[PDB]
UniProtKB/Swiss-Prot annotation, chain A:
UniProt-recorded name of the protein: Integrin alpha-IIb light chain, form 2
Motif (GFFKR motif) on chain: 5-9
Gene: ITGA2B
Part of the full-length chain shown: 1018 to 1028 of 1039
Curated annotation (Swiss-Prot), chain B:
Outcome when changing D8H: In BDPLT24; the mutant protein is constitutively active; spontaneous FAK phosphosphorylation; abnormal cell shape
Residues of the full protein shown: 742 to 766 of 788
Tissue: Isoform beta-3A and isoform beta-3C are widely expressed. Isoform beta-3A is specifically expressed in osteoblast cells; isoform beta-3C is specifically expressed in prostate and testis.
Protein name (record): Integrin beta-3
Superkingdom, natural source: Eukaryota
Homology family: Belongs to the integrin beta chain family.
Domain free text: The VWFA domain (or beta I domain) contains three cation-binding sites: the ligand-associated metal ion-binding site (LIMBS or SyMBS), the metal ion-dependent adhesion site (MIDAS), and the adjacent MIDAS site (ADMIDAS). This domain is also part of the ligand-binding site.
Modified how: Phosphorylated on tyrosine residues in response to thrombin-induced platelet aggregation. Probably involved in outside-in signaling.
Origin species: Homo sapiens (Human)
Subcellular localization(s) per the UniProt record: Cell membrane; Cell projection, Lamellipodium membrane; Cell junction, Focal adhesion; Postsynaptic cell membrane
Record: disease: Glanzmann thrombasthenia 2: A form of Glanzmann thrombasthenia, a disorder characterized by failure of platelet aggregation, absent or diminished clot retraction, and mucocutaneous bleeding of mild-to-moderate severity. Glanzmann thrombasthenia has been classified into clinical types I and II. In type I, platelets show absence of glycoprotein IIb-IIIa complexes at their surface and lack fibrinogen and clot retraction capability. Bleeding disorder, platelet-type, 24: An autosomal dominant disorder of platelet production characterized by congenital macrothrombocytopenia and platelet anisocytosis. Affected individuals may have no or only mildly increased bleeding tendency.
Record text on subunit structure and interactions: Heterodimer of an alpha and a beta subunit. Beta-3 (ITGB3) associates with either alpha-IIb (ITGA2B) or alpha-V (ITGAV). Isoform Beta-3C interacts with FLNB. Interacts with COMP. Interacts with PDIA6 following platelet stimulation. Interacts with SYK; upon activation by ITGB3 promotes platelet adhesion. Interacts with MYO10. Interacts with DAB2. Interacts with FERMT2. Interacts with EMP2; regulates the levels of the heterodimer ITGA5:ITGB3 integrin expression on the plasma membrane. Integrin ITGAV:ITGB3 interacts with FBLN5 (via N-terminus). ITGAV:ITGB3 interacts with CCN3.
More details: The constitutive activation of ITGAV:ITGB3 on neoplastic cells may contribute to tumor growth and metastatic potential.
């Protein structure tokens, strides 16, 4: 993916 | 993920990292 890795949880 | 990951900056992520999040908390 792109950012979800930590975005789905962070952002 | 297109609901929280990215979709968040779409809704009200402005404070969804400060207050608008604890709403869910």
């Amino acid at each position: 993916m792109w950012k979800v890795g930590f975005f789905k949880r962070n952002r | 993920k297109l609901l929280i990951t990215i979709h968040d900056r779409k809704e009200f992520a402005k404070f969804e990292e400060e207050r608008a999040r604890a709403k869910w908390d």
